[PDB]
Design a protein around this nucleic acid. Sequence first.
RNA 1: GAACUGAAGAGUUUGAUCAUGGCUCAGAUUGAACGCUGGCGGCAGGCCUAACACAUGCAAGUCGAGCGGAUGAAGGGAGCUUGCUCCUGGAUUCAGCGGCGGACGGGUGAGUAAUGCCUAGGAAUCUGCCUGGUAGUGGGGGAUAACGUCCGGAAACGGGCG
RNA 2: GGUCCAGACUCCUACGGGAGGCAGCAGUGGGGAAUAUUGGACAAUGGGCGAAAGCCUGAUCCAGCCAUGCCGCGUGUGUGAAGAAGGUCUUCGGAUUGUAAAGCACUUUAAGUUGGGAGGAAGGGCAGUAAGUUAAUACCUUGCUGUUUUGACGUUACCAAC
Lengths: 56, 81, 205
Amino acid sequence: VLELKATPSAPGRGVVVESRLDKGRGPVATVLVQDGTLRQGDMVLVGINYGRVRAM
Amino acid sequence: MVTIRLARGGSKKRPFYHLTVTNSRNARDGRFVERIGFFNPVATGGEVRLSVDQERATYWLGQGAQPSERVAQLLKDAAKA
Amino acid sequence: ARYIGPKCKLSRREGTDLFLKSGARALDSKCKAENVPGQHGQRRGRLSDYGLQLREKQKVRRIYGVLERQFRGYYQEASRRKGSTGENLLQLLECRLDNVVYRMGFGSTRSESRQLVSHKAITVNGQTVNIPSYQVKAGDVVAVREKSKNQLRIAQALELCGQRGRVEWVEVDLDKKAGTFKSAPARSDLSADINENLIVELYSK
RNA sequence: GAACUGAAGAGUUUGAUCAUGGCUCAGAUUGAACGCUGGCGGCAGGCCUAACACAUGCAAGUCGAGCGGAUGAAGGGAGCUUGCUCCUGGAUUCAGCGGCGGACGGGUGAGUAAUGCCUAGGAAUCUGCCUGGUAGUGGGGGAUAACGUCCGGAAACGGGCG
RNA sequence: GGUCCAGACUCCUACGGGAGGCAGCAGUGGGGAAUAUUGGACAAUGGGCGAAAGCCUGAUCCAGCCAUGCCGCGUGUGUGAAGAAGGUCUUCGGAUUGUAAAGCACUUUAAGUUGGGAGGAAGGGCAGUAAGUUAAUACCUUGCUGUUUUGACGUUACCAAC
Ligand SMILES: [Mg+2]
Ligand SMILES: [Mg+2]
Ligand SMILES: [Mg+2]
Ligand SMILES: [Mg+2]
Ligand SMILES: [Mg+2]
Ligand SMILES: [Mg+2]
Ligand SMILES: [Mg+2]
Ligand SMILES: [Mg+2]
Ligand SMILES: [Mg+2]
Ligand SMILES: [Mg+2]
Ligand SMILES: [Mg+2]
Ligand SMILES: [Mg+2]
Ligand SMILES: [Mg+2]
Ligand SMILES: [Mg+2]
Ligand SMILES: [Mg+2]
Ligand SMILES: [Mg+2]
Ligand SMILES: [Mg+2]
Ligand SMILES: [Mg+2]
Ligand SMILES: [Mg+2]
Ligand SMILES: [Mg+2]
């Protein structure tokens, strides 16, 4: 299949593997990055929730 | 101690200063003892850049009040004119 | 905001001239200005005292083209000032920059003078002003920017202001389009049909 | 020269009327919320409820010109030989003792009906650093942290001797 | 944002044994109709220490979000009667939407792109000179002179061109 990932310098794009609510740090989303690179302090749009990543 | 410093008023990016005699352990814009003039960093037009009471300033300096660095420079400039 | 739309239904509803077109051709031969706008135009419908006061205020506002909140501010300032708020309101309305540019013949109407002022083509004391609310003081010199002195709009506006009546409180220097504001025009310098007593009565309730 | 200048009523009880009397409405304001809609800028404001419980970062340190100690540059060189060793010197950095600061700045309104707050008074007090005067800083003593040493503890760290 | 004791509640643990206090700034859960960013810098004004460079500062100065409020400005301007086409009403004559639209001709504020461009900055290091202090052209303090060096906001306010 040659497993070509396109550039790792593209804006991040991935899918949610699971999600939960933590009483100390709010909604936590376990996401599998598909292509691009995800960096801390980045505006993320997932489903209907949006926001930017305080932590990763 | 008792100091003479600048209390900041005015608005965003437009500062105005009151030359105030305060106990040192007070808020910058809190309670004071006496105001002895003002300083205008922008001025222009009919506005004056700085004005001080010579009498009150000398009286308070004679009573052991320590002016700040800006107050020292501005007061010596006012005494120059 | 600004009222943008048919600028002649206002004259028909108010029932007076209420200058909003350039006045070039006429008013009667454009709209049959004898009926209120809409389907029920032929009905007369004598109205009540509150209606008369409301119509007077609306007529003044639509003459000078200002909205309700700014007009309330003008009323509050006129009440604050000394000497008979009734004509204080007119003194204050007659000093706006767009109105002054209109009176000097630079624009055909108030909307076109607003167009000129807002688009940075007018200097008051040798420096650019583009706020159509700037209260010009006695002795200012309204002029036209040199890069904006060749617009035709000013040419037609001047040649048509040449015949509408002598304002006799601003001196226009026609050759190079420079003016002068001698003073605010007193109540006797304006038309004696506006009943500002109705406006003061309406707001004092 | 100024510091003001100021006061509207209406609907509804009856076949109709006057009075009494309630209800309702027309105004101005919010630390506002909701519904529909939404271009820009300037200046402000933003847990009013649970003084409910809190993951994670930061919010109070500084002084080597008070004091031992250990870290030990560049260099002058000395030897052997390309680089090392040695010495003198030594610049920088601080774990510890010690001096100040930490009682300020920042948050909240639970308690409090009067040891609180506001206004006007007074008499019996203290007050680092700050200002101006007055008189001085002469000479000894015993310690102790750091450190070395000996055990226990998963660690946190603790204990005895010099 | 110190100590000791007791208590309620969470947690660690190697089961021997300890730790904690966001009504500081961000942030989370919960309650609620409802109230925001794990942002940047100590450049400015202040505060602590220092002798002085200087270090620290979620005070502060600023940025982010939200029509929450106040204020200001835009969404074009003039001419234009076949009184167009469509809609609506009609006494079927017509009226009205309406100079409104189209057509014709003008303007480019705000927003977009490009290029210029202040003010917030006082000071600090070095070098020289002159006065005062002594006992002294020393050290040091103070005037002045020359050189060098400082801005988070920030792609600043503002200005010019398409
Ligand atoms: Mg508005
Ligand atoms: Mg009845
Ligand atoms: Mg609260
Ligand atoms: Mg140290
Ligand atoms: Mg306080
Ligand atoms: Mg309370
Ligand atoms: Mg009680
Ligand atoms: Mg705390
Ligand atoms: Mg908080
Ligand atoms: Mg609590
Ligand atoms: Mg809830
Ligand atoms: Mg809300
Ligand atoms: Mg600072
Ligand atoms: Mg140091
Ligand atoms: Mg820190
Ligand atoms: Mg910070
Ligand atoms: Mg806004
Ligand atoms: Mg809303
Ligand atoms: Mg038709
Ligand atoms: Mg500058």
